Symmetry: C3
Subunit: 279 residues, 3 copies
C-alpha cells in the first residue's frame, strides 16, 4: 500500500553531514543509503552505515544531500546529476547562485534529475521569508541582522595569518544589516581583537537571526514585519536540506532555489491534511 | 458643532495631503481650501482636490480662521508672519530646534499686534515628543533623557544628498544607534565616488548605490524616548515612551489639533508646552476630565 | 534566640549612608556606630546620625562583631587589615578587579592569625554579578558571556576627567553598545579628550545629570555537555549603592558562618548570606 522510502546518500561527513544524518533517520519517508567520503577519510577510524567512496557502492540512491565545501559543491553536483540522482546543497555564496543555478539546470534537464541549490539557513529559508516580506510590502527596506554567532569563513580567514595558533572570528550584528567583527586569538568594518587562552573554549554553533522590513502595502505606509530565530545553525541547515530532498522528488528536471518551489512540496504528509492543518 | 472652524491648508506636499484628511475627520472643522504656488496650479488637478477650492492666495478662500502651514521649513516663518498680519491664526511644525525660541519671539510680536494666535513647532519630534519630554523632566528633575528616532528618512538630510554633484537620486536615513546618537544610511542612484563629506563628516556614515531609491521609500518612523532620573531624592526612576507611526499622518493630525487650540488662546505665539492639554481636545470640559483624568 | 550581630559602619559617605539603612532593616543585626575620620567629626551631625555613636575608632563602639568598610578603594585593604588584626570581621566591595587575588591573599593572612573573616569585593559587579557569571560558566562551559553595563555613572572615569584641564566639573558615563563594548559620554562644565569611542558635550550644570541607578545586562550563549545554543539572560535595573550596601550587609551575615580567612563571593555557600533557619530556607527556596 504505502510508498517506498526515499533513499538518501550524504556526500561529505563533516559538520553539516553529521547533522544531516540525524535528519535523514528522523524523516519518516526517508532511509539512509550510506555516506560517501573522500578516500583519505575511509582510512581514518570509523565513528552499520555503509561508508563508501562513490554513490555506486550504495545501491539505489534517489537523492544525494551534498554537505561538501562550497567551492567543490557545484562540480560534485554536476557529476551526480549526470547519473540521474537528484542533488541538494546549501551553497552559500549569494552572488554566484544565479550562475550556478543555470549551470546546474543544464545538466539536470538532460538526465531527468532535480537539483535544489542554496537550500540552507540564509541562502535558504531566510530567502523564503525575505521574498514573502517583499511582496507583502513592495516599497521599503529589509534588514537581515545575523545575531551574535560564528562566521565560519571569517575565522577560517583569520586562521590563515601568521601568529599565535588558532583563532575565532565572529560577525556581531550592529543593526541595519551592518556588522562588527570580533576576533579571538577585512578592514572596511570595525574590528576588535582579543587574545585568549583556548579559542576552542569559546565555540558554539547556535546563531541568532533578526530580519526586519518596514514598508508600504499597496499604498499604506508603516507596515512592520519582524522575523527572529535563535537556532542551532547546522541542525537547521541539515533539516532544511532534508526537506528539500523530499521536495526534489516532486519537481520536473531542472535546478531550483527555494523561492521556485511550492512551500507544501517540502512537507511530509497528505496534501489535504497539511492544508487543513496549516493554511 | 454650530459654526465650524474654517481651515486653510498652505502647501500641498506630504503634510498637506495628510492634513486634508485630518481636517475632514475633525468634527469641529471644515476645509476652506488649499493655497499653492502659481506654478503648481498650472500642473493638473489631483483627484482628491475635486470640489476643493485651490488658489494662490488665502484671500480667494474668504473667511479663514486658521492656516495650517505645510511649507518647507526655511520658508515657513515668513509665510506665518504674513497670515498672522491678516489676523489669521497659524499652525506650523517648524523643525529646527535651535531656532525655535527666536522664531517664537518673532511670531509673538506679529500675532499680538494683530489679535492672532500662532502655534509653532507642533508636529512629531518638535511637537508631541516635546510635550512628553517635558512631562518626564518635571517628574524626575535629575538625570538624562535620550530621544532615539528609529530607522526612517530624514528629509532635510536626504535632500542634502540630492544636492551634491554626481547624484541622480538619493535617499538618506537617520538610524538610532543608542544614547541619542545616530548613524546615517545613504542610498544613491547613479571610495568610488566623490562621496567624501559635504558636511556629514561629523556623523558615522555608510553609502550604497541602489537601482531605484524610489523603491526604498516608506514614510513610517519609530521613536524611543528614555529617561532615568530622580523623583525628589529617590533614584532609579525609569521612563520609556515609544511610537511606531505614520510620520506625516501624525504631524498633520497634531497640527489640526493645534488648530483647535489656537481658537482658544489669547493672541501670541506658543509652543505646545505652553497650552493646557485639554485645549487640544474636542469635547465638553467635564466630559473629558471624566473620560481621561 | 541568638544575640544580634553588632555591625559598625566604617566611612560614612555614599555607600555608608545606604549601609546604615541596610543594617537597620536587617533583623539579625544591630548598629554599633559609625567610624569617621576625625576631620569629619568636626562637621555638623547628619540628622540621620542623631542618637548614633559616631566616633573616630571602633574601640569606642563596645562589642563589634563585623565592620562594613565603605571607604575609598585604595584605602580599604589597609583599613581591613587593621580591623582583622583585632579579630573583627570585615566586609568590603573593593573593586579593582586585577587586584583581588592579591588583596585576598593579604587579607587572608591576617584573618587566619586573629580568628577573623574577611569577605572582600562583595558589591554588585565585584560581587553578585560575579556569582551570576560563575553559575553561567559551569552551566554552559563552552561559549561567551557579555556583561553590558547599561547607562550609568562611572566612578573612576568621572573622577579621571574631573581633573585634567579647565574641568570646573564633569560627569563621565559608560554606555553599553553591545557584546561587552562601551562608549564614553562626557558632559563638562576644547578637543582634549586623551587619557575608546567617546563623545563630549558641554552643559551648564553637571550635577543636574546625576542619577545613581544603573542597568546591567548579562547574556551567554554556549554549550551544555555537547548540546549547543543554550541561552541565558540576566538583567537588573537598580539603585547601585542601595544594592551594594545590601550585599555587604548580607555578607556580614555570611562572615559569621565561615572559618577564618579571606573570601570572595564565589567562595561562600549562597545559603550563608540568608537570614533564617537552614532547613526552612531550603524548603522555601530550593
Ligand atoms: N546555506 C547555509 O545556511 C549554510 C550554512 C552552513 C553551511 N553551508 C554549506 O555547508 C558547507 C560547510 O559545511 P560544514 O560546516 O559541515 O563543513 P566541514 O565540516 O568542513 O565539512 C566539509 C566536508 O566535505 C568533505 N571535504 C572537505 N574538503 C573536500 C574537498 N576538497 N573535496 C571534497 N570533499 C571535501 C569532508 O567530508 P569527508 O571527510 O567525508 O570527505 C568534510 O568533512 C559550505 O560549503 C556551505 O556552503 C550552508
Ligand atoms: N515637526 C515635525 O515633527 C515635522 C515632521 C515632518 C515634517 N515637518 C515639516 O513639514 C514641512 C513640509 O514637509 P513635507 O514632507 O510636506 O514637504 P513637501 O512634500 O516638500 O511639501 C512642501 C510643500 O510646500 C509648498 N511650497 C510653498 N512654498 C514653497 C517653496 N518656496 N519651495 C518649495 N515648496 C514650497 C509646495 O506645495 P505647493 O506646490 O502646493 O505650493 C510643497 O509641496 C517641512 O519643511 C518640515 O519642517 C515637521
Ligand atoms: N559594585 C561594587 O563593588 C561597588 C559599588 C559601589 C561602591 N564600591 C566601593 O565603594 C567605595 C566608594 O563608596 P562611596 O560611593 O560611599 O564613596 P564616598 O562617597 O567617596 O565615601 C567614602 C567615605 O570614606 C571616608 N573616606 C574618604 N576618603 C578617605 C580616606 N582617604 N581615608 C579614610 N577614609 C576616607 C569618608 O567617610 P568619613 O568622612 O565619614 O570618614 C567618605 O565619605 C569605593 O572604594 C568602591 O570600591 C564598590
Amino acid at each position: 500500500r504505502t510508498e517506498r522510502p526515499i533513499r538518501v546518500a550524504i556526500i561529505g561527513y563533516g559538520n553539516i553531514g553529521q547533522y544531516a544524518l540525524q535528519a535523514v533517520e528522523e524523516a519518516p519517508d526517508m532511509e539512509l543509503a550510506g555516506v560517501v567520503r573522500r578516500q583519505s577519510s575511509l582510512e581514518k577510524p570509523l565513528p552499520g552505515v555503509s561508508v563508501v567512496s562513490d554513490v555506486s557502492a550504495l545501491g539505489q540512491v534517489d537523492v544525494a544531500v551534498l554537505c561538501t565545501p562550497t567551492r567543490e559543491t557545484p562540480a560534485i553536483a554536476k557529476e551526480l546529476l549526470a547519473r540521474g540522482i537528484h542533488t541538494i546543497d546549501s551553497f552559500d555564496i549569494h552572488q554566484e547562485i544565479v550562475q550556478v543555478r543555470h549551470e546546474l539546470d543544464e545538466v539536470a534537464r538532460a538526465h531527468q534529475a532535480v537539483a535544489i541549490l542554496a537550500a540552507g539557513t540564509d541562502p535558504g529559508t531566510c530567502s523564503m521569508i525575505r521574498s514573502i516580506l517583499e511582496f507583502m510590502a513592495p516599497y521599503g527596506i529589509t534588514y537581515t541582522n545575523v545575531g551574535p554567532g560564528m562566521s565560519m569563513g571569517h575565522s577560517v580567514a583569520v586562521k590563515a595569518i601568521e601568529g599565535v595558533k588558532d583563532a575565532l572570528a565572529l560577525t556581531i550584528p550592529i543593526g541595519t544589516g551592518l556588522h562588527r567583527r570580533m576576533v579571538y586569538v577585512f578592514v572596511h568594518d570595525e574590528t576588535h581583537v582579543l587574545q585568549v587562552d583556548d579559542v576552542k573554549q569559546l565555540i558554539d554553533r547556535g546563531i541568532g537571526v533578526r530580519m526586519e522590513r518596514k514598508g508600504v502595502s499597496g499604498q499604506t505606509q508603516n507596515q512592520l514585519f519582524t522575523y527572529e530565530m535563535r537556532i542551532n545553525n547546522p541542525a537547521l541547515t541539515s533539516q532544511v536540506m532534508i526537506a528539500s530532498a523530499r521536495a526534489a522528488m516532486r519537481q520536473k528536471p531542472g535546478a531550483y532555489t527555494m523561492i521556485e518551489i511550492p512551500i507544501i512540496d517540502f512537507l511530509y504528509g497528505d496534501r489535504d491534511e497539511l492544508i487543513r492543518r496549516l493554511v
